[PDB]
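Teaching note: in complex prediction, the entire set of molecules is handled at once rather than each chain in isolation. The prompt given to students was simply: 'Predict the structure of this complex.' The entities are:
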Amino acid sequence: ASEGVLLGMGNPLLDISAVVDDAFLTKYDIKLNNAILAEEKHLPMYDELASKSNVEYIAGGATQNSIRVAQWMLQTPGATSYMGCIGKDKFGEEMKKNAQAAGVTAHYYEDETAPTGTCAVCVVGGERSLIANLSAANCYKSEHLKRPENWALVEKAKYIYIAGFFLTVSPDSIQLVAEHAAANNKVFLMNLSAPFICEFFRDAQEKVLPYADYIFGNETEAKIFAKVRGWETENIEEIALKISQLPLASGKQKRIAVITQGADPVVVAEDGKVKTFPVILLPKNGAGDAFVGGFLSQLVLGKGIEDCVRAGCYAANVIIQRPGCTYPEKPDFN
Amino acid sequence: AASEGVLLGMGNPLLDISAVVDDAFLTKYDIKLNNAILAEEKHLPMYDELASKSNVEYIAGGATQNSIRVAQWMLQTPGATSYMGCIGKDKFGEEMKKNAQAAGVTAHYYEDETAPTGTCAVCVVGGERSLIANLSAANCYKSEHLKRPENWALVEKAKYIYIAGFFLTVSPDSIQLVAEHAAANNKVFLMNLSAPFICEFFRDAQEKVLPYADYIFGNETEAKIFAKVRGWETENIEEIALKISQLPLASGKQKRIAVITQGADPVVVAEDGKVKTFPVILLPGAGDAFVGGFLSQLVLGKGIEDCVRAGCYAANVIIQRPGCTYPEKPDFN
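The expected output is the structure of the full assembly:
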């Protein structure tokens, strides 16, 4: 994998992961197996987690998690890049530290007033409770992207992955890199993630879809996508095919749609046909992002779709057995 | 009559800069009609050109503020309405203050120290419009402004408090605070399904406020997204409206009314486990105006049919004008 061969752009959050007890959950009125927005009552909780010794800080956010998992899976130094917005605070410096530890070349845009986005990941057994404060992650501006030191990361990249959620934060950055990729034989990849469905988002998504070589999604996202645009089918295999056959921009040959269904098989539409892949488990939160990261690693290495899906399932199965989107030193995938 | 500050709205205010444009202007800035675009910064040459037009207008906009202004126009009683939201410390913030005062709305804006005021270029040709929005300060509202005694007095004064669902992306603490206050003090709290949430973070915030909503407004597309997101297999808008009205209720709330519009098709209203449907009556961004007309009659203690008819009247007036504007006085009975 060449230097900066894969780039991601998104909404970075510093994940503050810690194994907690009943007293902590009751104190901040947080229930397990649910992701809530941080309120004024939850803001001092980030200080309490920071004050603990066994705390793990991770350069998170869905896209950044995928880029880190791709980097871990590739094991080649300098193969990945990432751009997103952070604040000028200690949590921003921790995000810079962890991105460097994960081997990702991160060029963050520093907002002058917004604190860095954070996410408390409270762990008990195999259960999590996410409390997110997006804050600076929503302030990315295309002026950062257009600077020569940051545009060099787009120029270096052969694969550029940006989540659909970023269409609400910086649609000018997505359209700029998507149009650049079509004009310069690069692969543009996106997902069906969205905070909400509004006219502004609908129109921005419609403008980028022709430029997407790959579209990733989960069954719920695919079914919302199909219903929003009037497709009457609820079959995920047919929805994946219809996504792959959306209109194509000039300079884009084909589109591949990859739809995950949790325990049920991964659905892949390509060349007017749908192939389905059963999930293979390892002996005995962040799983979707890890799946995309494993898929991207093999895509970068020019491998086939079955290797891409198997690597995605491997990475997803590793990450689910660890607190947060974390992993061991080296992978063991073939 | 309507008492002082009887109706309050909280939201994301934008100064709408409206003007009739021509083909040359649309081509110049590569703008498509019947399209909503989010701009990261103000396209300064376009804003100056729009300002230099003959029929230009500066309106204190944003979906909720539009509803509050339409309700104030419909009521015609000075001081009956209030509004809170975030603006910047600039000329557009002062124009926003000027237009809110001209519309007769008591606006207590939170002034962000660095973010410019949110703006929206409204480019109108015929019966079509194109919107280019730079939200900027509108997304920086903080509950510290709400909790100040001079601003909390507007909550205390109000009998009806209306907030869009989208405002949960800006200040969920303000929404939850006023929604919980309304349930404890016999006030009516109203919301809409605008920007239906798909993300788990936003879904959990909405789930926490829905038990406090006495009224939920929505359109057919929003209602169908809401139903699909939470696993309801029905696609019938009449049944979806009934299921919304029957969502769990918080302590101190006896019933919920769900109002779903369907464009040309009738207004659907669910109440007391039954669904009543109202054909649209015609005159010889209409949704905000519909809500404003409905709110005006609700403030006057009128029945649901009057509320729906006033909503249709206001919506039919606003569609025949550039942006969410109206004549001096209403003619509704």
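Point out the following to students. Chain A has one domain: 6-12+60-116+134-320. The domain at 6-12+60-116+134-320 of chain A is CATH 3.40.1190.20 (UDP-N-acetylmuramoyl-L-alanine:D-glutamate ligase).
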